[PDB]
Amino acid sequence: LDLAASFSAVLTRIQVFVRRLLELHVFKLVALYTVWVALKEVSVMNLLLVVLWAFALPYPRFRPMASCLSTVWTCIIIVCKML
Amino acid sequence: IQNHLQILLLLVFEAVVYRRQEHYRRQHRQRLDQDLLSCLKYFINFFFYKFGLEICFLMAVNVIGQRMNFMVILHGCWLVAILTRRRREAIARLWPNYCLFLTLFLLYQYLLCLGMNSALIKWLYLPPNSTNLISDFLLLLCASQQWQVFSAERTEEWQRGEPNPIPNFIHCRSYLDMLKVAVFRYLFWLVLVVVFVAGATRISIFGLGYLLACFYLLLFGTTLLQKDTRAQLVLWDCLILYNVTVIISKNMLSLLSCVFCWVIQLFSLIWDSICFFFLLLQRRIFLSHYFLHVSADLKATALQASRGFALYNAANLKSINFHRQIEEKSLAQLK
């Protein structure tokens, strides 16, 4: 009956809220895992990745540049795994 | 390496979520006072815009407490330098410099990690633990977001004749009014209990300072509220400064944990930070408009005090007359 419609409406509201929360918070929440990894094992490879997000957080102008360069910095993971 | 792989996966998912949100977009407060849910939505929407300075201060105190080393002493000194210019207009010019100094010192701090007794070299950072840097990174994140919001100002919202819209909490015609009065009037009388407990649970000789502060305010809080905002904020700044002095001094004396009788007993080498949280919250409450009405209520009670005495005398005389009447009736019965 109305239970299915209520569930569908709740799912739609949850999706809208999740999208809004992501669009509002992910720009800062992205660097959290990188910071946790950098603090987990301090290394020269992770230092540049940490510093990029550190400078990006203060100046939002370089934030899109840091988001673009995140993939370039992550390339060191394959080299570290191979070594 | 599973950790680096997961980090790269999260980095990719960061842009994946942005692309999905963009596709979902392309494809597919005035109401604050009405109900509690509306006010909760307001807090969800502009928590940072209102409470950024307090949150950054409390994260700073968090890192002070977590590290207790020599490097975070600069954190503490710059914290106090921020506090002494408490008014937000000075912070307006100091905050960009604050962020620049934070990033400048964090760069050196991170560089020092990778690269003269053992206890002292551990207490300092010279050739060096680095797990504690998570709190400092979180501080930088919060300060940067505060800088961003402050620069933006969200200028379209910014969410004494009569500016207070619905100040009349005192009559409590709605559940929201009940909560607002329980926060705006019966909370100072919980800041006092928090100060007392903070003093009396950490037995060091700074807690005795808290006991003096609680005993003083508790004898003069009821008349402190009657004062205008000027003296209130002055004395509350004094108490906040004493509390931050206590926490920074405890950070300093943490050095005495490396070079390690009666002195250590007498200085006893969290509770001194929850008091900071409540002090900042109450200092935000004071200057707010929604406290003017309760201050007016207290003024009204102070002026109305005299009437209650005459009312009570009337009640006593009524009871005395009643008992004289009943005694007279009984004695007439006996006669």
UniProtKB/Swiss-Prot annotation, chain B:
The chain holds residues 924 to 1346 of 2547 of the full protein. It is found in: Endoplasmic reticulum membrane; Endoplasmic reticulum-Golgi intermediate compartment membrane; Cell membrane; Cell projection, Lamellipodium membrane. This is Piezo-type mechanosensitive ion channel component 1. It comes from Mus musculus (Mouse). Residues 27-51, 86-98, 153-174, 226-238 are cytoplasmic. Belongs to the PIEZO (TC 1.A.75) family. The gene is Piezo1. It comes from the Eukaryota. Pore-forming subunit of the mechanosensitive non-specific cation Piezo channel required for rapidly adapting mechanically activated (MA) currents and has a key role in sensing touch and tactile pain. Piezo channels are homotrimeric three-blade propeller-shaped structures that utilize a cap-motion and plug-and-latch mechanism to gate their ion-conducting pathways. Generates currents characterized by a linear current-voltage relationship that are sensitive to ruthenium red and gadolinium. Conductance to monovalent alkali ions is highest for K(+), intermediate for Na(+) and lowest for Li(+). Signal peptide: none annotated. Expressed in bladder, colon, kidney and skin. Also expressed in bone marrow, liver, lung, spleen and erythrocytes (at protein level). Expressed in myoblasts (at protein level). Expressed in red blood cells. Expressed in cochlear inner and outer hair cells (IHCs and OHCs) and vestibular organ HCs. Residues 68-69, 202-206 are extracellular. The chain crosses the membrane at residues 1-26, 52-67, 70-85, 99-114, 131-152, 175-201, 207-225, 239-257, 270-286. Homotrimer; the homotrimer forms a propeller-shaped Piezo channel with a cation-ion conducting pore. Heterotrimeric interaction may occur between PIEZO1 and PIEZO2. Interacts with PKD2. Interacts with STOMl3. Interacts with TMC1, TMC2, PCDG15 and CIB2; the interaction may be part of the MET complex. Interacts with MDFIC (via C-terminus); the interaction prolongs Piezo channel inactivation. Interacts with MDFI (via C-terminus); the interaction prolongs Piezo channel inactivation. Disruption phenotype: Embryo lethality at midgestation with defects in vascular remodeling. Conditional knockout mice in inner ear hair cells show no auditory and vestibular defects.
